[PDB]
């Protein structure tokens, strides 16, 4: 019952949602959805360059 924020979009993650992703250097990231997870990791997008992140 501790609420985290998405590492990409900044949204709050209610409990039981999203994944916690561990980078190879030991840094832990949390993503609310597969949309944010592929944007941050698989495609390397910039959250400041996406309108839906800025207008969130």
């Amino acid at each position: 019952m501790k609420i985290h924020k998405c590492s990409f979009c900044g949204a709050d993650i209610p409990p039981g949602y999203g994944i916690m992703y561990v980078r190879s250097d030991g840094t832990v990231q949390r993503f609310c959805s597969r949309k944010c997870f592929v944007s941050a990791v698989k495609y390397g997008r910039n959250p400041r360059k996406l309108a839906w992140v800025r207008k969130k």
Binding site: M1, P14, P15, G16
Partner: protein, 336 residues
Amino acid sequence: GLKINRPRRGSMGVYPRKRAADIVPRVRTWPEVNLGKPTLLGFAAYKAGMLHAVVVDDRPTSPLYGKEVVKAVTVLDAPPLYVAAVRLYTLDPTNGYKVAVGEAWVSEPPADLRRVLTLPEKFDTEKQLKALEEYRDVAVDVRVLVATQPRLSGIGKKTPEVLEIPVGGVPSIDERINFAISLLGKTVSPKDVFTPGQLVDVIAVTKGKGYQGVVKRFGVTILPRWHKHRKGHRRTGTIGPQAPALMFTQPRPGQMGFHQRTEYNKRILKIGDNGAEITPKSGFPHYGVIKGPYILLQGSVPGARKRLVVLRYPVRPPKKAPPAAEPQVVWVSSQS
């Protein structure tokens, strides 16, 4: 026999896998329970949907004790039941069969009941109770014929469902019969039947899936190196030896889904009174909204998202009793 040993594909305990004769579950077994007072041994509700709740583990020996754990839950829209009749049972002396020896009805059955029952304009309860009392010495079971009130559910249909629910909780058949008589024409809420935190059994008809192949119905393997096989790959190679012929244990395509299934030991997490507290802001998908009482169950339940589910006291409960306190549900995913 086989070249390499392995268990048979799918169960033969559910043979034949035919469509259920009734959309309503027909419970065969009811437990003998000692609750210190008369009470209905079961309840019927409608499956609304699934959520997940943050539940504090209350098992002292569990490795997650104290911690908060996310669990999938099932929501049951549970409007109160209407008691219409009281039926007495006795044992046939010739074979020991349980046989109904008469019944008494509420004098004014509701108008919805006329959609399924050819009832008289006015029943006479006092004679029927009078005639019933002559069988009090030979009575061995008492059940109430309840009718669901689907107008108070999210489905909004009008035709109700009728099923017998036995009265239990005390060994006295005489005391049981008096309590059943006192419920004629009244209603029973889920809180009257169950207390939150306890275990129940669930019986329902599962979701229909129509005609299905042997790969899905029985979990038989697709033919390996699938492209190599002429005449298809979603099949078993042979359909039997030369002798015996086509057996009844050979997997075949047919009906899958719409069957009656029973599941044991589901824990009651919450029995709420107002459905607005649990319904999502978007509504339950393909169901609607819950406006009356509801029951929160831990885990999954058989059936589709509007099926009538029967909850009963467990027949195979675990050795260690679950905790006496009501389970602590921190948060439900339908809430904000």
